[PDB]
């Protein structure tokens, strides 16, 4: 019954559930950390990565991510997390995805507070299993 209307219509709800029960665990680094403390001011699933992820700091974010409830989502905030950004060199991980599965990327440097709002609003339509890619496919509610 894994793919039978019973179980199906069920997880549809559970998903729609943990959709509005999203508890954000910001993991700020540099300049992006400051822009987000301008959006939060006005046991966690969903961590937000804001800034340049250093290669020294990389293994740390891994642990923090692992030890986490199992239904989870990673948001990649700004240019430095989403890819190497403008720092295309040794010191910096070129895309946080290199270390943890990302569910949503948000451009900007740093992206406006209200952008990060759309970022999560999107992560919503995604855990609902109601979001598609440019290729017209349906996206899996969670990276794993």
């Amino acid at each position: 019954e894994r793919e039978g209307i019973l179980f199906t219509t069920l997880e549809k709800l559970v998903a729609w559930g943990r959709s509005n029960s999203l508890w954000p665990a910001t993991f700020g680094l540099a300049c992006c950390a400051i822009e987000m403390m301008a959006s939060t001011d006005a046991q966690a699933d969903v961590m937000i990565v804001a800034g340049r992820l250093s290669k020294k700091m990389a293994p740390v974010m891994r642990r923090v991510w692992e030890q986490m409830p199992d239904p989870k989502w990673v948001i990649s905030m700004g240019a430095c997390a989403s890819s190497g950004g403008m720092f295309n060199n040794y010191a910096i991980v070129q895309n946080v995805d290199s270390v943890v599965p990302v569910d949503v990327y948000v451009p900007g440097c740093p992206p406006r507070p209200e952008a990060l709002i759309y970022a999560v609003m999107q992560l919503q339509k995604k855990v609902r299993g109601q979001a598609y890619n440019e290729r017209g496919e349906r996206l899996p509610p969670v990276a794993a």
């Binding site: 890819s83 990327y105 900007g108 440097c109 992206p111 952008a115």
Partner: protein, 154 residues
């Protein structure tokens, strides 16, 4: 406050727009000079020869491929500054997070002036049949963004 539109200033650094002249030709003559000044190596330009009978732009040279990797971009406008035509100009759209990395490289058709909204915004308004709402307002649209139709009751 995704219920009350964000008021941004006229100089604001948003999603690049590629403008046209009155005539309807594009302003861009594929010179790859924007790409040149860019600190991030975020612009790729392939040039093509205009067809005299059916012209893209006023030169002998237009831009066959134009592509900006927004995940690399920093929004410095260094590009709009390098441009000799006034083609590439940062715009107002900011609502533009998305799911697959390679879905974040915009294209010519993604940044022309006539286009309202960002990839996500227009893609969702596709499978939905509900017109696009931009989450902002501005006092006025810059002299530079001639043509750009934006929600600016001010």
């Amino acid at each position: 406050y995704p219920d009350a539109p964000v008021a941004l200033k006229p100089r604001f650094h948003g999603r690049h727009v590629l403008t046209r002249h009155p005539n309807g030709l594009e302003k861009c003559i594929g010179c790859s000079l924007c790409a040149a000044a860019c600190p991030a190596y975020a612009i790729y330009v392939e040039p093509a020869e205009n067809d005299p009978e059916n012209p893209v732009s006023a030169g002998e040279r237009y831009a066959k491929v134009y592509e900006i990797n927004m995940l690399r971009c920093i929004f410095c406008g260094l590009c709009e500054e390098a441009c000799p035509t006034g083609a590439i100009v940062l715009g107002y759209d900011f609502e533009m997070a998305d799911y697959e990395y390679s879905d974040l490289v915009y294209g010519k058709e993604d940044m022309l002036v006539d286009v309202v909204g960002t990839k996500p915004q227009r893609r969702e308004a596709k499978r939905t049949g509900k017109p696009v709402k931009v989450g902002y307002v501005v006092p006025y649209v810059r002299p530079e963004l001639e043509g750009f139709k934006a929600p600016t009751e001010g």
